[PDB]
């Protein structure tokens, strides 16, 4: 009744709140809270800190903290347990590179129980969304580290947040109850047990027999025909959000043959999008032109779409040399058939659908694309080494994008640096992205989003196939279930039935 039952394909992880790779995002977020907290309109308000000032340079920043929040253990949450938290995090700073805050923070200390300061090397105008973000930037109780560090571990999960881990059963159950001594608003649940279940159609099945009492999650949520056939029946409750993220290739323009910009330009033109949506996403997702859609801050630059073209991508490609030989249906050029490797994860039966239809429109213009689909870890390393051709990828929603996304492309972790090292403008681009996250100049910052987008849209980087939604499947007696500003969070607090 105040109690629910949900499913998650793992276990949550330990839940360390400064870690990635076991712990599960939502759960961090359900158990430990950020100094300032993400609206939906993209601002941050006050949460455990109250208010703050920076200077006039704007490198140094002064949080008053609340003075009236407790860790669920009955330990303070005080300006000495935030700056011991951020000493942690950035003993390992060389796991957060990605996140430029982590490279700009170059002091933390508590001036008082309730007054900490935070020194940066820049002035950061993304320094407020960051701090937001469900890690790595939120506090455990200091004594709950392991020799002084969270970086190789930590002991309970003790955090200031409306949730506290009950208990977590492997390949059965995680549970959570409500904190009740909570310094915020309390959640009308109570308790919440997510089911483990790996397999997208057996949630379904856990769904439709009564198992469980809701499914919270984006296009992979389950099967899409079944999420239209539970629209239809009266018996259930079904929601799909506004659009939160870009599903897109990136294209490899450091590798034959997709180092031609004639060849990703038409590449770009080759994919039926509203086709592919229409069949393998049974017309639930947007058709993406833009590696961000117009509604993204800074991203409303008129960028010219290509079309669904095949006479257009064949012409591109047969003017750039890339002609059929006789009998053949497979262009070559300097002796080198047309060629292209896509990567994907190959137990994602989403991105292996829409990889089918991708080739095979591909194919339509004389291009042989090859189906490589392997475990996490394989497409990771292809990743961050750049053996790829083409590969899936996907934008982080808000408050990520676009600054995070474009700050990350700077360095191998995600495939966007490798992806674009065949680029004469990298070297621009990047530094481009430094000094726009350092930009208080309105004007200016909008002018650097604008080339930097601009120009890698100009050179095919990408190409976008559509923007995704989240979903929600639920029992009717639950209501409306509302969405969370963070796309990996679920708003269990405010699911009042």
């Not at 009740?180 to 057996?202: H, L, M, Q, S």
């Amino acid at each position: 009744p105040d109690e629910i039952t949900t499913a998650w394909p793992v276990n949550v992880g330990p839940l360390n709140p400064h870690l990635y790779t076991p712990n599960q995002m939502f759960a961090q977020s359900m158990v430990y809270e950020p100094l300032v907290k993400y609206q939906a309109d993209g601002s941050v308000i006050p949460w455990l800190a109250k208010s703050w000032t920076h200077s006039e340079d704007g490198k140094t920043w002064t949080f008053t903290l609340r003075d009236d929040v407790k860790f669920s253990n009955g330990e303070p949450f005080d300006a000495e347990a935030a700056a011991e938290n951020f000493r942690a995090v950035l003993d390992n700073r060389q796991r957060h590179a990605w996140l430029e805050l982590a490279n700009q923070i170059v002091d933390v200390k508590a001036l008082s129980k309730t007054e900490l300061q935070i020194t940066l090397k820049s002035a950061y105008y993304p320094f407020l969304q960051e701090l937001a973000l469900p890690r790595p930037f939120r506090f455990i109780a200091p004594s709950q580290f392991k020799n002084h560090e969270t970086m190789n571990g930590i002991k309970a999960p003790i955090g200031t947040g409306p949730w506290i881990l009950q208990e977590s059963k492997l390949n059965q159950y995680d549970v959570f109850v409500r904190n009740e001594n909570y310094w915020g608003e309390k959640p009308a649940i109570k308790k919440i047990t997510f089911n483990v279940i790996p397999d997208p159609t057996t949630r379904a099945v856990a769904f439709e027999t009564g198992d469980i009492d809701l499914l919270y999650g984006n296009e992979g949520l389950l099967p899409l025909d079944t999420f239209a056939r539970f629209s239809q029946n009266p018996a259930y409750h079904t929601q799909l959000s506004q659009p939160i993220e870009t599903v897109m290739l990136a294209l490899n323009t450091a590798k034959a043959p997709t180092n031609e910009l004639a060849v990703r330009e038409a590449l770009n033109y080759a994919v039926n999008k509203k086709s592919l949506i229409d069949n393998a996403l049974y017309g639930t997702q947007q058709v993406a032109d833009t590696l961000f859609a117009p509604s993204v801050p800074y991203a409303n630059l008129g960028l010219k779409p290509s079309q669904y073209d095949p006479q257009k991508a064949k012409a591109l490609l047969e003017k750039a040399g890339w002609t059929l030989p006789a009998g053949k249906d497979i262009r070559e050029k300097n002796g080198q058939p047309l060629r292209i490797e896509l990567s994907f994860i190959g137990t994602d039966a989403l991105s292996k659908s829409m990889a089918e239809i991708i080739q095979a429109d591909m194919r339509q213009i004389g291009a042989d694309v090859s189906l490589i689909g392997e475990e996490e870890s394989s497409i990771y390393a292809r990743q961050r080494d750049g053996r790829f051709g083409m590969i899936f990828h996907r934008t982080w929603g808000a408050p990520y994008d676009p600054h995070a996304f474009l700050s990350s492309m700077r360095v191998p972790s995600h495939a966007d640096f490798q992806a674009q090292q065949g680029l004469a403008d990298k070297p621009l681009i990047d530094k481009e992205i430094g000094e726009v996250l350092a930009t208080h100049d309105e004007t200016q910052r909008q002018a650097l989003y604008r080339d930097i987008l601009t120009r890698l849209h100009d050179e095919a980087v990408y190409l976008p196939i559509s923007y995704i939604s989240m979903m929600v499947v639920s029992k009717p007696e639950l209501g409306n279930i509302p969405y969370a500003p963070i796309a990996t969070e679920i708003p269990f607090e405010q699911i009042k039935p």
